[PDB]
Amino acid sequence: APSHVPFLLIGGGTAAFAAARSIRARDPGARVLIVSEDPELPYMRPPLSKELWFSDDPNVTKTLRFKQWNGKERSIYFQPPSFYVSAQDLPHIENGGVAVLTGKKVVQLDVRDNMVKLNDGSQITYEKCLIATGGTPRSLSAIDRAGAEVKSRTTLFRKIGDFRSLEKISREVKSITIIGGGFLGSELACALGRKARALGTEVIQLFPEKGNMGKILPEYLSNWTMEKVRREGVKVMPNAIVQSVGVSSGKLLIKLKDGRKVETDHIVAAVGLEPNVELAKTGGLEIDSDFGGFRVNAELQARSNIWVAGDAACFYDIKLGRRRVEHHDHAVVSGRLAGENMTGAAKPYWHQSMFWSDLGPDVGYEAIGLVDSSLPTVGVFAKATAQDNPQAPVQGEDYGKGVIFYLRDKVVVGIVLWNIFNRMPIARKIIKDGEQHEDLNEVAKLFNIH
Ligand SMILES: Cc1cc2nc3c(=O)[nH]c(=O)nc-3n(C[C@H](O)[C@H](O)[C@H](O)COP(=O)(O)OP(=O)(O)OC[C@H]3O[C@@H](n4cnc5c(N)ncnc54)[C@H](O)[C@@H]3O)c2cc1C
């Protein structure tokens, strides 16, 4: 660990890596240090809830290689270890390169003196710095307030480590319960459901909302989705409010506020994330009270010499207003954009990032913009043409293929492409134009629906 380094990147996930690759591309001589709390070198997370589960290789938990949707096999890691330079070496080695100081944590930040202090006492000074701290899984107070007995049987899910433990458990218990109906809970339910199909074991998913992906999708579509998650071999329990959790003769017992009791062997809790904003205290950086995370401008800049990117960044979108996005692709785009800006670029966030998700073979979608079920929607499908806050939506209908528009005024500000491939460039085009559209059935033709 050197005492000075030109570019300091705090946090060793997706955003930070994208930043490093970007800086090097715009300054082929650059010297970049990543300080990373995790012992692991930068890796992507999506395969931990999706592809690593569907691998036919039994060695998959050691190899950590997966197949992409298009044949090509690869590693979970961004680069092979042999592509980074030592932390000690980084000041000298000609041409520079990227170093990763693994297993250390930044615990104090002094913006005045361009300096960080590590948890071991080390101090580093910097010319340019990026916070890319990500966030931590939220906990359930019903679990927080229980005993060792309970907590020992409870998983949060974020790291490679978590994928090794849960994969092991799935192979040796009879029943697992997922608590949460968002992205992680739902994707996990499917992966575990396809696994339980072989052994005839059970998988329960329960949550407060009426159906999966309640905070993202309109009610009709969220309902349609839940039915598909069931068909993956999952026992879905909507409208469940967890009251308490204890053990009874070696088993977990979940008690719902409705009087029902759920018995199970293990619990995974997917109930959102808390953005990692500890450094904001000592650094004296503005936190956003509405969205959470560090408040930064359109260029991801907080103070001079310091930028924020990824899950921890609340930024200004010139086109869609202030936001904070927590998705893989956004981490890449914003990390890459901060890299450019740390090497003088000065460009505002403009190329919109996107996301995607899959729940069994029949639910596959991509999305862009402000995609929030609390906004008015207009949806258009190969069966019906439904509006929600050309008529009001009917559950039980066929919703296998369509596009859903999310509105502010007459302006489309978010789109979800529902089992439709290869039309993302047009979704981008529509968000960018920001026209007040007369008839959205016209706009929908752009996506081949009809
Ligand atoms: C299982 C899983 C599946 C996902 N799948 C998808 C998907 O399919 N599609 C999609 O769009 N998104 C998905 N996401 C989101 C994706 O994982 C991105 O990683 C995340 O949105 C952005 O990563 P980031 O670099 O901003 O933060 P992170 O990847 O969280 O990295 C931050 C790193 O900083 C370290 N750190 C924190 N504080 C400090 C500190 N103070 N000092 C030093 N180090 C610190 C943390 O340990 C962490 O390693 C998924 C997430 C998970 C967990």
Ligand SMILES: NC(=O)c1ccc[n+]([C@@H]2O[C@H](COP(=O)([O-])OP(=O)(O)OC[C@H]3O[C@@H](n4cnc5c(N)ncnc54)[C@H](O)[C@@H]3O)[C@@H](O)[C@H]2O)c1
């Ligand atoms: N495909 C994807 O984009 C994808 C996949 C996996 C993970 N991720 C990321 O992983 C992170 C965390 O995943 P997540 O699904 O936990 O976050 P999330 O925000 O999607 O989940 C929020 C869900 O937590 C549940 N919840 C909140 N409070 C609860 C409570 N008190 N009791 C019971 N349930 C409660 C609700 O069901 C709510 O919908 C997110 O950043 C997510 O974007 C994304």
Ligand SMILES: NC(=O)c1ccc[n+]([C@@H]2O[C@H](COP(=O)([O-])OP(=O)(O)OC[C@H]3O[C@@H](n4cnc5c(N)ncnc54)[C@H](O)[C@@H]3O)[C@@H](O)[C@H]2O)c1
């Ligand atoms: N779009 C997706 O469904 C998807 C899937 C996995 C990962 N990602 C991630 O998103 C980022 C860039 O997005 P991208 O859209 O250019 O990724 P990509 O390179 O996979 O896109 C290529 C095209 O493949 C299309 N496609 C056609 N048939 C598909 C199928 N059967 N299953 C999945 N996709 C199919 C997608 O719609 C996309 O337009 C990358 O980080 C990538 O890893 C996207």
